[PDB]
């Protein structure tokens, strides 16, 4: 038993980073079969985030301009484009360890694992969501542009998540494989803030289950409520509202715990009007969001990649 | 800039893990150069693990009674030995993917990383603390046995904890990989309890460092303190004692930041006596331990593996 946050295991990624340097800029590419992918601001100066036309910029880039060096072994590249916010950098060579992939697009409250990487090299794992306003709370220091974030489905990795920016709050902001960024941040460097990063409440829930399963239990009460009843709550507190489709998500882990859904709501409901009084849960004394009913059912099953 | 709880790339653990069964009893063991390790409890059936004498069990069992599974591919059993709580496995193939490794034995409050597995199958990877009364807070369940806990250090695996047991009370016990249990525990299926699980003090103020860093910056106050007075504090709340050694390791971040440790001392004795007040530090509640000093320093400063 045990509840950790986790990660997917990451060498199928790894076996992906690449160097990529265009001028003065270094970062990370993912390469993929016969393409290395990166954020198009390689091609900027310090000087030309603050207003860059890209397409502009790009015309001054040769195929020989952009460096790839997979390991200690350079790639050659033979074209190159633009794809909305990311390059792709066609090389002459298939990466050999590329695995099973798919890119997708996630919607906020979707967990995933990020790959943070400097020079092509990856320096450590780590599991975080996609918040309600579109950022992620990451590590990501100067150079981790380009680290990806993806999900494990027995041998086939979905990419979802590439890193461009931090915003000037310190939270982070990138695409999806495609090249389009998650909500309404921009690659320049400008005011762009953050909105309200409200809790995700069917995460929270899921996490309560795990609590459940693995024996912390004092928070269960002697109440319930309502979709309606609790959204009020949910509301007050800068908490997702809850849908009948969430509820049904949460069937499975009701049925294994024998705690109706809206009887773990009203437990919430209790924990956010009383707070914890300095008591823990699964070792935290915030209710945790950054769990999805499908990561706790998979970790609370041991489910596997090869 | 950002914080994470972050692991360590998984991919050369990955490719060490293998599936062991012995009789009906299947979990993982580590496959480096041409041995096999795995936790001698392989060989006992769910009635054997109430009072084993594992000499006795194992003179039961043959080379051919230990099925290794490598992927897809059987490995051939050549020889086995007893050391301590772990066997070793003589196969008749080296690990074609035996990275640089190191055998190394922890000490309370260093971290390390885990890849859970099952029937030989990564499945994630976290991050967790060697605690002061020795035992682990991992997730693990049945056919988890035989994980194993790492650190890099760039091509280097040094290998520090085997998973072997669960105590009545969910914590982890396990061995290094000479097969020596960390803390007084054993493998047998017996009341085992933990001593008092202290907060790893050096690892808290290393945090506060890191939040500093990251510009969390609220609990910082006008005081300072000596290590004594600390220390008498730190003793009414379950903390380790804070030593000159920890002061010392220290010396970096307190450079970096310009805040002397002893003022930080200060900034948490505050803490443990005042609480948060419903505020947070790097979107915790609680004073994090599971980050080493060097952890902070590597996460702070981005470095990589190869
Ligand atoms: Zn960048
Ligand atoms: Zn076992």
Known sequence: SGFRKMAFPSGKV??????????????????????????????????????????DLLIRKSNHNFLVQAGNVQLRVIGHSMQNCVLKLKVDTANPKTPKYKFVRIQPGQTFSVLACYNGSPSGVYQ?????????????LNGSCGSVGFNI???????????????????????????NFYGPFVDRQTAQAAGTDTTITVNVLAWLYAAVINGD????????TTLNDFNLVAMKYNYEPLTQDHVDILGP????????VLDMCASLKELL???????TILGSALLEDEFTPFDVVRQCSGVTFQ
Not at 128 to 140: L, Q, V, Y
Not at 273 to 279: K, S
């Open 14 to 55: 790894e076996g992906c980073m690449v160097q990529v340097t265009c001028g003065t800029t270094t970062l990370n590419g993912l390469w993929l079969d016969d393409v290395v992918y990166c954020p198009r601001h390689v091609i900027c100066t310090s000087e030309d985030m603050l207003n860059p036309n890209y397409e």
């Open 128 to 140: 975080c969501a996609m918040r309600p306003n579109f950022t992620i709370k990451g590590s990501f």
């Open 153 to 179: 489905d027995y041998d086939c990795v979905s990419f979802c998540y590439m890193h461009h920016m931090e915003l000037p709050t310190g939270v982070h902001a990138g695409t999806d494989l495609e090249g």
């Open 217 to 224: 239990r004092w928070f269960l009460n002697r109440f319930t």
């Open 253 to 260: 882990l009701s049925a294994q715990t024998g705690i109706a």
């Open 273 to 279: 009007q009383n707070g914890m009084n300095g008591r």
